[PDB]
Design a protein around this ligand. Structure first.
Ligand SMILES: NC(=O)c1ccc[n+]([C@@H]2O[C@H](COP(=O)([O-])OP(=O)(O)OC[C@H]3O[C@@H](n4cnc5c(N)ncnc54)[C@H](O)[C@@H]3O)[C@@H](O)[C@H]2O)c1
Ligand SMILES: NC(=O)c1ccc[n+]([C@@H]2O[C@H](COP(=O)([O-])OP(=O)(O)OC[C@H]3O[C@@H](n4cnc5c(N)ncnc54)[C@H](O)[C@@H]3O)[C@@H](O)[C@H]2O)c1
Ligand SMILES: [Ca+2]
Ligand SMILES: [Ca+2]
Ligand SMILES: [Ca+2]
Ligand SMILES: [Ca+2]
Ligand SMILES: [Ca+2]
Ligand SMILES: [Ca+2]
Ligand SMILES: [Ca+2]
Ligand SMILES: [Ca+2]
Ligand SMILES: [Ca+2]
Ligand SMILES: [Ca+2]
Ligand SMILES: [Ca+2]
Ligand SMILES: [Ca+2]
Ligand SMILES: [Ca+2]
Lengths: 300, 294
């Protein structure tokens, strides 16, 4: 019935990733002369100025691009841009992380940071082949790691996960509370995609596990990179029957109920998960595609 | 604007995977008594009988379930089913691909096989932590491997990939040929999802890399598990402009062109023509077909 009103945060622009150059050490070296550089702490946090990620003049850590660096592409202009991990002084400047402060960034800076954050985290967890055990080595602007023994390439890992709004086909929708959340704190149902299933099967499965409903007419709404540490979230809605009672089998879910559009609007207008307020239902931070899905349904 | 006519092979709501039991060694052991067993060789091949997967009596390889096995869940009527990697004797009829022959199987058997095939392939490539390098060990019905040093869990890896039909908004569609394919053999454009991008951005990016078009109105069609060895394919269509010339930049693409509705229908039935299509259980075929018959 409905569509997303807004493009989810972190999806708003695609970089010029400049795929061409990744395997061209020389053109990388030529453009490093006056390239840009972005720097992340071990927490993914970064420095922000005027809503933009801080881009340092690049040739101040090297004459040539280092091995631990990751090529992110070209900004509007033509200038190469890279990311490194480095320790950052916590006390000399505010360090912003994407999950709690992504909305303060411009769209480009958010893309850069999301990419950089997921890649650097990947390298930190891919220094060895899972196949045999050999050490691995960065190559091609940091987009592969090559095995030392065999020469086999290993590639960045993004794990797909669904998030779903179950509704009755009209004016009512399922929201649920996980046991490990504060009270009065609800959202959509989510799950990782297992091997050997479609997204549509994954939605029906996870819904059935978590709240015990049978759902149909499973439909994609959109997608959002989610580097915490390495997910991509895929948004869906589906139709359930309110007359079928709930059942918490995969007991991740403490409680759940059907809510009206009215109820949800009221909850949205009182804030998100991070607001202190009176309300007996509070919903997720606008960072999440979950909030965009709920909002898109509740206002029509 | 248009939809898939059929649910892709392998994509029908599948199995009672019985997630509950995976971390309950004892209930697994109780049900092994007269469980079922499915067996896959190193090439992913399997045996068929009467349109169904071969399910052997399970207890004939041990008293208890082995560690290299993988629990697949319960068939209709509480009965556990497991998968193991083993050699096959080949005095039965063994399907070299499920990829080329999965159409012979009932939906359930195809789900079982798809799950089994992706899991077993995963174990074979996940015997070590990528973090530190330690050995890893099966656990929980084969659904995790635990690190030997640190105790940290590693989980099955399914890599998401897009596959896209670019069309002009009317009667013409892009198909492309990879280098070292037979001539006159074209298909959809595909690419892996990189870190930090949406599916919609991934489609536009991969299309631009491979054939040099700028595309808009990117729309999801459906999805299909693709254990060859470890993908999930996400089907899309998008609008491009035929007046913009092609360009093979990253160009694993040898050649490409726009084809008419008519040309595609003819190719689907198909030698003779300038365009033939590969014969697969792939969602690619279902996408092309669904566009061509409006
Ligand atoms: N409202 C929400 O619930 C909400 C909001 C924003 C983001 N998310 C995201 O939903 C995603 C999916 O996770 P979830 O919260 O539904 O499940 P979960 O994290 O609550 O628990 C599922 C568990 O399955 C295991 N697992 C299974 N397969 C895995 C895999 N392939 N890769 C990594 N771990 C795997 C992990 O231990 C995981 O914790 C998470 O990344 C979460 O950040 C959810
Ligand atoms: N029409 C088709 O070509 C068609 C049809 C059905 C299925 N598929 C499947 O789509 C998937 C990806 O397609 P592609 O190979 O054209 O994508 P692509 O354009 O990203 O090619 C990248 C190449 O580099 C490697 N690579 C890059 N990222 C990888 C990753 N994240 N995981 C594993 N390898 C990676 C692979 O070896 C691949 O051959 C594959 O499973 C492929 O078999 C394609
Ligand atoms: Ca390019
Ligand atoms: Ca401090
Ligand atoms: Ca879950
Ligand atoms: Ca799950
Ligand atoms: Ca679950
Ligand atoms: Ca009620
Ligand atoms: Ca269950
Ligand atoms: Ca044999
Ligand atoms: Ca034999
Ligand atoms: Ca490709
Ligand atoms: Ca690519
Ligand atoms: Ca490519
Ligand atoms: Ca032509």
């Amino acid at each position: 019935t409905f569509r997303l009103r807004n493009i989810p945060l972190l999806s708003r622009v695609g970089l010029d990733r400049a795929d061409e150059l990744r395997s061209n050490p020389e053109e990388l070296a030529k453009g490093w002369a006056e390239a840009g550089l972005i720097t992340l702490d071990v927490r993914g946090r970064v420095n922000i100025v005027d809503g933009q990620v801080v881009i340092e003049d690049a040739a101040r850590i090297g004459d040539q691009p280092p091995e631990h660096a990751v090529f992110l592409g070209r900004i509007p202009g033509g200038r190469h841009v890279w990311a490194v991990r480095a320790d950052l002084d916590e006390d000399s400047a505010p360090l912003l992380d994407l999950r709690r402060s992504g909305q303060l960034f411009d769209d480009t800076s958010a893309a850069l940071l999301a990419t950089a954050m997921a890649m650097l985290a990947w390298h930190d967890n891919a220094g060895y082949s899972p196949v045999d055990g050999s050490p691995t080595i960065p190559a091609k602007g940091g987009w592969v790691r090559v095995n030392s023994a065999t020469g086999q390439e290993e590639f960045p890992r993004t794990d797909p996960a669904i998030i779903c709004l179950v509704h009755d086909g009209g004016d009512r929708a399922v929201l649920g509370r996980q046991k490990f959340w504060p009270e009065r704190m609800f959202s959509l149902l989510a799950g990782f995609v297992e091997a050997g299933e479609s997204l549509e099967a994954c939605v029906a499965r996870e819904v059935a596990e978590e709240v015990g409903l049978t759902v149909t007419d499973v439909q994609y709404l959109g997608s959002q990179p989610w580097p915490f540490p390495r997910s991509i979230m895929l948004g869906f809605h589906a139709i359930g029957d309110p007359s079928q009672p709930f059942a918490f089998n995969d007991g991740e879910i403490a409680e759940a109920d059907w809510f009206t559009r009215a109820e949800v609007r009221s909850a949205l207008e009182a804030g998100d998960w991070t607001t202190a307020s009176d309300s007996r239902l509070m919903l997720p931070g606008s960072i999440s595609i979950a909030r965009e899905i709920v909002e898109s349904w509740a206002y029509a």
